[PDB]
């Protein structure tokens, strides 16, 4: 399927020696359009907090951001468009499109530049598609 | 610049252990919007033959396709959208957008799948942008 190929041959691609640990494309309601093998199960409250942070940035920063019950420290993101979090050497990037969330989870520091920025680039592409 | 970053941090990215030898984004008139360091100089006749092949597919197949005077054997492509050529272990991929040509040149066989298909993915993105 189109959405599975976006995960397996765009988001999960090894780039400059590094690959996401996991990735998925979800609806604004947290429905899984497509996902990687080790992608975590979000809780509805977690998706609601992410969505509230996109509507009003700074919502998640004081308490942190939870993913399958794992705490992530909110770090700088693009307001209303991207939410970034850090846990240990890894982190999470969430890009919001008109109809979807693109999610990438990393276990290791990525290379500098846009080469590894697969979550943001796929989200930009779907937005230009009107999705 | 936006067009240079597309070349340096999208097209020239190392992906699954392989990187393009060279890449560029050109107008339909062969003007260089942005290019890699070792990108070749196309001749106007070469750009005209590529453009004629997009307007009428099969134009270049009998005589081959010339890039800086180097012969490439035309191989299967998407008619009106993509032109692919082979020279030795390497090859060339040309994707046509509404206003531009995306060009990638490889010295080595790429990995199977869309992960390495940077020329086609950038061209799709610009087309969705209306470019």
Swiss-Prot record, chains A, B:
Name of the gene: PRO1
Protein name, per record: Profilin-1
Q: What's the miscellaneous note?
A: The variability of the residues taking part of IgE-binding epitopes might be responsible of the difference in cross-reactivity among olive pollen cultivars, and between distantly related pollen species, leading to a variable range of allergy reactions among atopic patients.
* GO MF annotation: an example: actin monomer binding
Cellular-component GO terms for this entry: cell cortex; cytoskeleton
- What is this protein's function per UniProt? Binds to actin and affects the structure of the cytoskeleton. At high concentrations, profilin prevents the polymerization of actin, whereas it enhances it at low concentrations. By binding to PIP2, it inhibits the formation of IP3 and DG.
Q: Which UniProt keywords apply?
A: Actin-binding, Allergen, Cytoplasm, Cytoskeleton, Disulfide bond, Phosphoprotein
Q: Indicate yes or no for the key word Disulfide bond.
A: yes
């Amino acid at each position: 399927g189109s959405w599975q190929t976006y995960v397996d041959e765009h988001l999960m691609c090894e780039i400059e020696g590094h690959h996401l640990a996991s990735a998925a494309i979800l609806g604004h309601d947290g429905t899984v359009w497509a996902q990687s093998a080790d992608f975590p199960q979000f809780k509805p409250e977690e998706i609601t907090g992410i969505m509230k942070d996109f509507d009003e940035p700074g919502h998640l920063a004081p308490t942190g951001m939870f993913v399958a019950g794992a705490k992530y420290m909110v770090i700088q993101g693009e307001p209303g468009r991207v939410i970034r979090g850090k846990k240990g050497a890894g982190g999470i990037t969430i890009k919001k499109t008109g109809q979807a969330l693109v999610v990438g989870i990393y276990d290791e520091p990525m290379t500098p530049g846009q080469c590894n920025m697969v979550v943001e680039r796929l989200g930009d592409y779907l937005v230009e598609q009107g999705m």
